[PDB]
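Issue: ligand-bound run for gadolinium ion - logging full I/O for the record.

Environment: standard queue, default settings, no custom constraints.

Inputs:
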Amino acid sequence: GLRILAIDTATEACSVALWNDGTVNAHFELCPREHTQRILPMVQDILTTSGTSLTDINALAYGRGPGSFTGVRIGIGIAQGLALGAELPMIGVSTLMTMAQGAWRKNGATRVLAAIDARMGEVYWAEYQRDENGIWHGEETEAVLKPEIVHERMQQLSGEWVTVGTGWQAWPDLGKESGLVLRDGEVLLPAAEDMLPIACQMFAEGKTVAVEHAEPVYL
Amino acid sequence: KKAGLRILAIDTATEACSVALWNDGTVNAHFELCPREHTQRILPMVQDILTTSGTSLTDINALAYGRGPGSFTGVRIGIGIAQGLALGAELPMIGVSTLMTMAQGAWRKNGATRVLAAIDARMGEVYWAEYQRDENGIWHGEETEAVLKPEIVHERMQQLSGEWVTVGTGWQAWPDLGKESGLVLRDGEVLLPAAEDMLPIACQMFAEGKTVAVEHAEPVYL
Ligand SMILES: [Gd+3]
Ligand SMILES: [Gd+3]
Ligand SMILES: [Gd+3]
Ligand SMILES: [Gd+3]
Ligand SMILES: [Gd+3]
Ligand SMILES: [Gd+3]
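Outputs:
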């Protein structure tokens, strides 16, 4: 069948998740001071408990960010090491889309507004809406900008959206006067488990990369 | 097929990104620069070297990695990649000092036996080390590794004696660090660590059983 191993260290969360035909085996935690110090243990626990072998995985999915500059790269490096080891293609998954896919998993959100607390007053933003087939649209809306522009962009949308990401909690004032119906997507950080559905789909479409060109996204 | 010590080393602790394999008496290495942590080039370098030597990751005896000190991000990316490469093949890992690595490079290039290693740690400091190669080719001075201010480096050099060679970006970040040290200093011809130089150190550590499991690969904390 089809097997995909997902890894994410892009934000304050570090997570691993194995998709095995339909069986999802995942772990999720907040990364300690030594950011990725738990990733390998998580990978070892998941592979052993699922009785799966790296030799039998079909592709490595990795969190491409945006998020922490340091965090993201370490996770990617780990994924590359594993992927070169098993001669496997890699799949870069947006942390914003991942959180969007997260909202739809907990409740049923279809129109997500991803906001991650970035650098300065800046913020990683994205407008994601999944179609009927369950595919997320709006990857082009991804960008890094100030809460003022966030306020502007928002007043050019419609209907009701659910919110995800640290951005909203950092500025609960971000929604104020957004001129839109807003709820709580119940997703603060992205999880590898949610990379799986996206990865699966990208693997089916050929949206993969050679280990040598796996890298963070540049907003 | 033909058995023999096989050790794969990679490093991204500094701006440099290098890889090297010790395969049956010979050294096969690549050295490049990876500015702004764009370390993806480590993977093709590893692949090419493996392919050229007819070596498989499963044939490796140990994977040597950069333990630092160096860039906060760089050292961790390197460890991450090394960990990824070691899991499937269950490769033992060997942490090699970035500072010691440069000392080894100085010996390689000019037979230096007493090395003053200094890395621009940024934010006003430097990673320091005093390494002396004994007759058996063993590097002493690891216990001297520390993070300190230039003025403190100056004070410490005055407590030193003899002739030394300098290596690392530390010296260029602080040009007067050598002046009035009371020591006779020559350039060691090493600005940044190179995987090639991790190999000798790694062979010796593997011989002494100084290794760790994948999940225990860690950066040094100074
Ligand atoms: Gd502590
Ligand atoms: Gd560029
Ligand atoms: Gd900077
Ligand atoms: Gd600090
Ligand atoms: Gd000679
Ligand atoms: Gd000079």
